[PDB]
């Protein structure tokens, strides 16, 4: 999972 | 998670 | 994170890169920490008296965990070693430990408030994949993983005794444990504070509170009272957000106002300091507004039904807002005052260069009543230019033209009467006087200027390709100063400042409430009254009345009306557009104030049909929906005298000419053809004739009576693909257009030779035509223009262009009382003008006879000659879904023997009873609930009377006229049973695998039926059900139908 | 290039074999070349701007060699215009066109096709005058040309008088002279007739392709056969001057086997994969070649790890030098002269 | 069909 919450 | 076309 | 002691509310914003605080009511918000912060994720705080401290986590280019006093003063860094992705924070209040987490190094750790006693709870472990947030309880720590999508529990001191609390389908981000122990009480020093607006707790010993005030407010020397800051600031609108940044380049906070987030495609903004509102457009064709502190973010008004607006400019004296609609090639106005919105189109795209080609920017001068806009031009007469006009749209003028390729927004310096604009093709910003005399290049070597604004002695511009906002001296373009840099998606600019309407009053302010709807200032201190779209100004100069004379231009996306005078660019009707519009032709009803059109769709149903609407956009109702062919309605003609609406619906291989009496259900077919395909139909109540065009095999133009009985051909030679036709009633000529011949021609009603009005290469695709006075008006699909030219053949004057660059033109019609006369003398004493001529259903006049030929929608015309009754003859009857319908034996008779009977459920089979004149029919409800009913064919025509219910699905029914009992078959129950005509006694005749149909021969005592089960056969038995034998039991699979002929 | 004399967006071409001059119509570029009618020698030497002005939607250009006048159509104004090759006299010939697409001048008549009127018309070449329609109701009209007899005897130049003069390409110039040229990736020899590979040039790498440009700005030719086509997504490139190779690393987030390091000679031959196996989730993020020892250094970019590797050219030996997790080397340059490696890091702690 | 857009 990527960091950016979007 | 980097640059691509 | 809520502050339960000081009653405040803190949060971290990743997009804004700030830490913000407000009251727990969501009011008086301010940016608390905006310096030196890149990606703030975590947040925790300790409101107790001894601490008054907050913590946040930033995972920017230098990750760190920082602490500060809750008023943001004493900021220190407590953790900046062994961290890559600080994600989530939590506080252990009893022992004052701060727990934090890392999604890259995959650990959970805690420290004291100084970050000294650092320990590892969970580390060097695979239980953590991408943990996000955590919360504490008594000796337990809970956290959420965005990688494994589950919530976990572990011992908060050493990470033992782990277990999965919850599995979640989506990524679990937030988590909190709700309990009073998590929210310890304490004394509230802020409760005694006298601070206005915000009172924030602080760690300073003497008082432990500090007064603060929201964005755009000033801290007075009293240190407790704040005053609103009236200093100007720059509104930097960007592709998805609008920021208010200070004019001082040293202030890098971006908190002059609450940011306007959630923008779809921002281009430019506009403000009203009288009510502190900020205006911007939205893509669906709306204008939104919000106060500078975010109180009433709401929609305000709809801008245009046929495209989104791009430019924006506000008049702060007349309280009108002007906008540009490049999708509609128009400059429009909207009214702010009052609870009712009024909008108008000022300038449109005529053929002249003075018109509007493609408006980009707009700047208004409320005093002196002047309006300026920048035009990209078109592939037409309109060039790229800087143009000016009065704010009532009258005096169009071209100020500057030349090498203005890729023009940008235009800005007016009111104090100096100097226009400013940017040119992307040369990368320069130019300026010039409002009179168009002087022009010089001010700034050179720009990449892609987007916004520019003049305030005071400086000119601010934002470059979208350098990603920079720069301030330069407006007089010479020297002394460049950079305000922002590395900001992507830079868009237009505007400076918010207080501007008084009193110092710049005009006509619309000295005379308020003079005009009924809209006031527009003009040069010289005067004012010009105006009306909203669809209304014309009355001769008194103040009131408004609807347009009584306009042309109705039909396009595929929308139906639009224009005035007959070319000097008026106002929209003469409220446009019909939006979802579901794909319109072929239009027709008008001038007397009643209705405009009809036919929508078409090749794939989705319920889009085909004829619909009506008033020219002001009220009481849209459907007209014809049922029974539309596969090719849809292809032509609409309205008889304004008799109130009949003729239309042609095309099937795949057939086409019908059909009449509907308006405001009534009377509808009947006049003509059914297969070789001919009538497409566009017109009606002439004066000469009492019906004309239509045909463009299939053997194209022609046909003339016929109102009942389609005396068809004759007018033109059949030298005609291919006649798209449309029109008539001038005062002269009796038929005008038509040929796109396949590039020909516009006319012919008299009685026939003769065809006269060529206009032809040649310069008329590629005429699609629709109309006649008004001495001139014809027609639309051209290829040229995207609506033309006007002399009706007389042999004229060589070039056509004048009414409007240009209209996509998908289809038709044009005149909405005028002069084009639809109603007086009996002007209609040649046409019948059906009074009481529909006495006819009950339809009133068809004949060319020279004084008495009308009444028509019958259902049934036959009686001896009275004006009333309708049942056929009293032989005809067919069939069931169609939830109805029983009738049909004559004659293929050339299209009248219905009786009106369609509506039943409940689905009708499957039926049979007729002579003696009582009734039809016994069966119904199917649900999967298995069959039903049998009967309905009378007499004038009473009551609801069908049920005979049974709860019986199975019934596939057939037959009536014994001799023995007066009813035979029917039950499919779902595998029996054929009988009944008396009253119901009453019922008996079983036989068992059958799959019975469908039954036929009887009472005079020979035999009864036949069919079966299509495992073996399909036709069986015979006596009416009592005895001596059953199969008549045919070979070569049958699905013998659905049975019929017995006693005559042979 | 940045100068107005270069091509911005060329649409049409007209060639004058005798007198050796090209003519072309340009749409221009933003903040660069304007929309103009330009001319140059057929070898490309003397760029010139003939007509500039109200040309916005400029269409193809054409030349009447017998009268030596240029013709062009402007869609934004709906006109067909004339102009001398000197760039002096300019005038409007036809009015009220819709969207001219093609035009040709032959004999005493000018033929033009209008795509929006769907028509082909003939007018005199001195003025509109006698308009005649050849075809009508013709959709999708495009450019036009007149097939006619023109011979090498009625007009001659240097390249026709002297066959076999240049080994690869001959380009005539005004005055009857001829200029030799040598393909793409080759440079003209000092003798002026033979060809040699472009010994000195510079390499620029784009995501779609790798291209080579000469250091001397007057040479607009490609100094290297471009590396392009399907499967190309270039992040970095490095050169091997002695052996004549160009090394580049491809990238692809979705499709595998589009990741790795390739080599190619500047003339377009001997394409070969150098590194294919063991590429990280993010591709080779940097390449550096040691031209002394023959070592190739490159960076593997895994999702949470980053390796610095060596590969001996023409040899299967491949080694990992460094494995880091908090630091992420991205672009590597090698200096054999001082025997050092420098790499740039743009993650946390740049 | 004949025309739809
Ligand atoms: C809340 O706090 C803010 C910030 O401290 C205050 O904002 C300042 O308010 C003053 C007074 O209105 C402003 O001073 C005026 O500046 C004008 C030009 O400013 C521009 O250029 C300067 C640099 O040259 C920039 O710093 C600035 O951002 C602008 O870009 C001058 O033209 C004015 O001079 C005129 O008025 C004065 C005083 O009457 C006369 O002496 C002069 O002769 C002349 O007529 C004036 O100096 C100041 O620019 C504002 N700063 C900002 C950031 O905008 C608020 O005033 C304060 N609010 C309250 C009510 O306390
Ligand atoms: C099918 O059913 C529809 C309704 O669903 C009918 O539509 C109505 O048609 C009548 C006319 O037949 C309309 O009545 C007309 O309204 C006009 C507008 O009135 C406004 O403006 C006038 C001043 O111009 C004001 O006085 C008034 O207060 C309103 O503000 C009037 O201008 C018309 O007046 C004309 O006729 C009357 C007599 O009826 C004369 O006295 C006048 O001098 C003048 O000649 C008229 O009153 C009505 O508005 C329509 N209703 C709707 C909802 O649209 C269809 O007629 C009906 N039939 C068909 C075939 O469609
Ligand atoms: C891995 O393996 C590849 C092959 O797969 C090697 O590639 C070869 O490398 C050699 C290096 O020497 C190349 O040979 C060179 O070719 C040059 C071009 O030759 C043309 O031009 C010359 C005149 O300049 C003509 O004589 C010749 O016929 C061609 O028309 C030459 O200019 C070079 O000359 C040098 O060596 C010669 C012979 O010793 C000397 O006389 C010269 O003075 C000069 O020093 C040289 O011959 C060869 O072309 C490459 N082949 C391929 C397929 O590209 C790689 O080198 C190897 N990798 C590593 C890192 O070693
Ligand atoms: C923002 O962070 C930077 C980087 O740490 C700070 O810059 C240093 O601040 C210290 C404070 O003692 C100085 O000693 C250094 O000389 C500063 N270096 C530079 C390059 O300026 C900066 O102070 C921080 N600012 C705030 C308000 O937190
Ligand atoms: C999980 O909980 C159990 C108790 O239910 C822990 O087991 C005891 O832990 C204490 C403290 O370390 C020891 O003194 C005991 O000897 C342990 N007893 C047993 C039965 O093991 C256990 O430590 C917890 N999990 C982990 C891995 O720490
Ligand atoms: C902006 O928001 C405030 C708060 O909702 C609006 O004020 C309320 O208006 C309603 C309806 O008139 C009243 O019943 C409430 O008592 C008002 N509350 C307050 C706090 O005054 C205000 O109307 C909005 N502004 C506008 C003009 O729409
Ligand atoms: C065919 O008949 C059925 C009933 O047998 C219709 O179903 C009804 O449809 C209307 C909407 O038009 C619903 O409001 C009713 O509730 C439905 N009734 C039942 C019993 O389901 C159906 O619409 C008819 N089909 C068509 C094309 O008209
Ligand atoms: C199809 O129908 C014929 C009707 O005659 C059946 O033929 C009869 O079959 C029975 C039993 O075999 C005989 O007793 C009769 O004499 C036959 N009648 C005649 C005149 O041929 C035939 O059996 C039927 N077929 C099936 C498969 O049922
Ligand atoms: C026409 O419009 C008005 C406003 O909706 C409405 O009140 C009136 O009833 C409408 N007329 C009819 C007959 O529906
Ligand atoms: C209409 O049709 C009838 C029957 O074909 C014909 O006799 C008559 O002449 C036609 N025209 C008129 C004037 O009724
Ligand atoms: C069939 O007959 C049965 C009982 O013999 C009755 O219950 C039922 O209503 C009939 N058909 C249906 C609806 O199942
Ligand atoms: C290199 O290219 C030449 C010519 O295409 C070919 O004959 C030769 O085999 C190639 N050599 C290698 C090692 O790729
Ligand atoms: Ca991880
Ligand atoms: Ca045509
Ligand atoms: Ni632009
Ligand atoms: Ni074109």
Automatic annotation (TrEMBL), chain D:
Record's subcellular location: Apical cell membrane; Cell projection, Axon; Cell projection, Dendrite; Endosome lumen
Protein name: Low-density lipoprotein receptor-related protein 2
Residues of the full protein shown: 1865 to 2214 of 4660
Domain of life: Eukaryota
LDL-receptor class B repeat coordinates: 20-67, 68-109
Family per similarity comment: Belongs to the LDLR family.
Source organism (scientific name): Rattus norvegicus
């Amino acid at each position: 999972x990527x960091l950016x919450x979007x | 998670x980097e640059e691509x076309x | 994170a809520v502050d339960w002691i000081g009653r405040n509310l803190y949060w971290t914003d990743y997009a804004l890169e700030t830490i913000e605080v407000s009251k727990i009511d969501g009011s008086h918000r301010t940016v608390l920490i905006s310096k030196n912060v890149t990606k703030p994720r975590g947040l925790a705080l300790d409101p107790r008296m001894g601490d008054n401290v907050m913590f946040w986590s930033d995972w920017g280019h230098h990750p760190r965990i920082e602490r500060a006093s809750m008023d943001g003063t004493m900021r220190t860094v407590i953790v900046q070693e062994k961290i890559y992705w600080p994600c989530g924070l939590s506080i252990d209040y009893p022992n004052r430990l701060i727990y934090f987490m890392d999604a890259y190094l995959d650990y959970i750790e805690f420290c004291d408030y100084d970050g000294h006693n650092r320990r590892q709870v969970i580390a060097s472990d695979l239980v953590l994949h991408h943990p996000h947030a955590l919360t504490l309880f008594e000796d337990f720590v809970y956290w959420t993983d965005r990688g494994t999508r589950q919530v976990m529990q572990a011992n908060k001191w050493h990470g033992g005794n782990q277990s999965v609390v919850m599995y979640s389908v989506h990524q679990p981000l937030g988590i909190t444990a709700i309990h009073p122990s998590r929210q310890p009480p304490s004394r509230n020093p802020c409760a005694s504070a006298s601070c206005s607006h915000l009172c924030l707790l602080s760690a300073q010993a003497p008082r432990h509170y500090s007064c603060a005030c929201p964005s755009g407010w000033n801290l007075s020397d009293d240190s407790v009272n704040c005053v609103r800051g009236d200093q100007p600031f720059l509104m930097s609108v960007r592709d998805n957000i609008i920021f208010g940044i200070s004019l001082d380049p040293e202030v890098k906070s971006n908190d002059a106002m609450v940011p306007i987030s959630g923008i779809q495609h921002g281009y430019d903004v506009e403000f009203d300091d009288s009510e502190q509102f900020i205006y911007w457009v939205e893509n669906p064709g709306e204008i939104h507004r919000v106060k500078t502190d975010g109180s009433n973010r709401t929609v305000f008004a709809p801008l245009s039904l046929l495209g989104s607006s791009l430019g924006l400019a506000l008049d702060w004296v007349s309280r009108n807002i002007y906008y540009t609609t490049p999708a509609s090639r128009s400059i429009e106005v909207l009214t702010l005052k009052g609870d009712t919105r009024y909008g108008k189109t000022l300038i449109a795209n005529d053929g002249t260069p003075l018109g509007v080609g493609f408006p980009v920017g707009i700047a208004v001068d409320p005093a002196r009543g002047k309006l300026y806009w920048s035009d990209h031009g078109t592939d037409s007469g309109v060039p790229a230019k800087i143009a000016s006009a009065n704010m009532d749209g009258t005096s169009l003028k071209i100020l500057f033209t030349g090498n203005l390729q890729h023009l940008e927004v235009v800005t007016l310096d009111i104090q100096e009467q100097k226009l400013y604009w940017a040119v992307t093709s040369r990368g320069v910003i130019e300026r010039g006087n409002v009179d168009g005399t002087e022009r010089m290049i001010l700034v050179h070597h720009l990449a892609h200027p987007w916004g520019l604004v003049v305030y005071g002695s400086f000119l601010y511009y934002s470059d979208e390709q350098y990603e920079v906002i720069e301030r330069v001296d407006k007089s010479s373009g020297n002394n460049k100063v950079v305000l922002r840099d590395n900001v992507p998606y830079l868009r237009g600019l505007r400076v918010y400042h207080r501007r008084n309407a009193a110092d710049s009053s005009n006509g619309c302010s000295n005379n308020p409430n003079a005009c009924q709807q809209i006031c527009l200032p003009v040069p010289g201190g005067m004012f010009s009254c105006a009306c909203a779209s669809g209304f014309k100004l009355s001769p008194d100069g103040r009131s408004c009345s609807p347009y009584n004379s306009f042309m109705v231009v039909s396009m595929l996306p929308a139906v639009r009306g224009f005035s007959l005078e070319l000097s008026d660019h106002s929209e003469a009707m409220v446009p019909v557009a939006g979802q579901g519009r794909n319109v072929l032709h239009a027709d008008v009803d001038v007397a009643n104030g209705f405009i009809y059109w036919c929508d078409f769709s090749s794939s989705v149903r319920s889009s085909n049909g004829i619909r009506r609407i008033k020219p002001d956009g009220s009481n849209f109702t459907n007209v014809v929906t049922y029974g539309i062919g596969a090719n849809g309605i292809r032509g609409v003609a309205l008889d304004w005298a008799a109130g009949n609406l003729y239309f042609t619906n095309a099937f795949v291989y057939e086409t019908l000419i059909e009449v509907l009496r308006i405001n009534t259900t009377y509808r009947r077919v006049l003509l059914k053809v297969s070789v001919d395909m009538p497409r566009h139909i017109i009606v002439d109540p004066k000469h009492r004739y019906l004309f239509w065009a045909d463009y299939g095999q053997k194209p022609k133009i046909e003339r016929s009576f109102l009942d389609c009985t005396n068809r004759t051909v007018l033109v059949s030679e030298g005609i291919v693909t006649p798209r449309g036709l029109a008539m001038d009633h005062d002269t009796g000529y038929i005008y038509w257009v040929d796109d396949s011949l590039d020909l516009i021609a006319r012919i008299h009603l009685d026939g003769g030779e065809s006269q060529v009005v206009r032809y040649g290469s310069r008329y590629p695709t005429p699609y629709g035509i109309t006649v008004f006075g001495e001139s014809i008006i027609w639309v051209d699909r290829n040229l995207k223009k609506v033309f006007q030219a002399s009706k007389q053949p042999g004229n060589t004057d070039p056509p004048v262009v009414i409007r240009d660059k209209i996509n998908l033109l289809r038709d044009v019609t005149i909405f005028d009382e002069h084009a639809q006369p109603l007086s009996p003398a002007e209609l040649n004493n046409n019948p059906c003008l009074q009481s529909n001529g006495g006819c009950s259903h339809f009133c068809f006049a004949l060319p020279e006879l004084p008495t009308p030929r009444c028509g019958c929608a259902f049934g036959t015309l009686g001896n009275d000659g004006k009333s309708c009754a049942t056929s009293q003859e032989d005809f067919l009857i069939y069931s169609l879904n939830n109805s029983l319908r009738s049909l004559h034996f004659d293929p050339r008779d299209h009248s219905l023997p009786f009106q369609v009977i509506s039943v409940a459920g689905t009708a499957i089979a039926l049979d007729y009873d002579r003696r009582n004149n009734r039809i016994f029919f069966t119904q199917k409800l649900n999967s298995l609930r069959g039903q049998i009913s009967y309905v009378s064919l007499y004038s009473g025509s009551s609801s069908p009377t049920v005979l049974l219910s709860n019986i199975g699905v019934t596939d057939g029914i037959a009536f014994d006229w001799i023995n007066r009992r009813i035979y029917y078959s039950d499919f779902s129950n595998q029996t054929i049973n009988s009944m008396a005509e009253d119901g009453s006694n019922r008996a079983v005749i036989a068992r059958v695998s799959k019975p469908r149909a039954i036929v009887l021969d009472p005079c020979r005592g035999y009864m036949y039926w069919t079966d299509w089960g495992t073996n399909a056969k036709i069986e015979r038995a006596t009416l009592g059900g005895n001596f059953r034998v199969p008549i045919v039991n070979t070569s049958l699979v699905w013998p659905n139908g049975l019929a017995l002929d006693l005559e042979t």
